[PDB]
Design a protein around this ligand. Sequence first.
Ligand SMILES: O=C(O)CCC(=O)Nc1cc2ccccc2cn1
Ligand SMILES: [Fe+3]
Length: 222
Amino acid sequence: LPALKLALEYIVPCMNKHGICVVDDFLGKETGQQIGDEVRALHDTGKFTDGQLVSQKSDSSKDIRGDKITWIEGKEPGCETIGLLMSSMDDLIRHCNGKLGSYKINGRTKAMVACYPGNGTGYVRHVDNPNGDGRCVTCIYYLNKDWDAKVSGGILRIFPEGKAQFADIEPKFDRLLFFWSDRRNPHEVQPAYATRYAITVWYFDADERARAKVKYLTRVEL
Ligand SMILES: O=C(O)CCC(=O)Nc1cc2ccccc2cn1
Ligand SMILES: [Fe+3]
């Protein structure tokens, strides 16, 4: 399905209605499997961090470590399929120009590639952008083949503001997710008992980032 059709007929209405949007089969099996292979290569090559410290033990060898990350621009060697994923996400957002809320999306971050090792670690409830740092849309791509939450966990639970219910999102293979980055969508990752990969990109609203930049002022010589 073309990016423009997807954007206008589903992503825009759904984001403006619920603030959470799921697109399944975003790139197809070939592309998705190659993305998975590139991410697994990065993991094999040691490109990831050791993971977030969850419990500090006095024998530091017994310290548990959770989500590993690596930042990917999309032009590194052996990452060109990741780059095409991000150019596709960019195409989607570009076709949504001006139609998601009142935001004018003028930029994005690098890709944060996250790897939950499958050792029972999750991610605690949080808000992506709680202090108006300019990020308005969180966009995530899941690449875990035949993931069964019932067996392996790893569900992303979003707690939409003002709604009692949850929104449970399994990290399905070739799945794309959009949600507002601010207080409207607190979320957490339930414990993962298998290796769980995700690729996240945050998109910037021009005005919010422009006035956020001031706090970064601390610059031109005199
Ligand atoms: O993998 C998913 O389904 C998304 C889970 C998630 O929220 N990861 C995450 C990771 C973060 C790492 C640093 C700062 C903010 C962060 C916000 N969110
Ligand atoms: Fe998050």
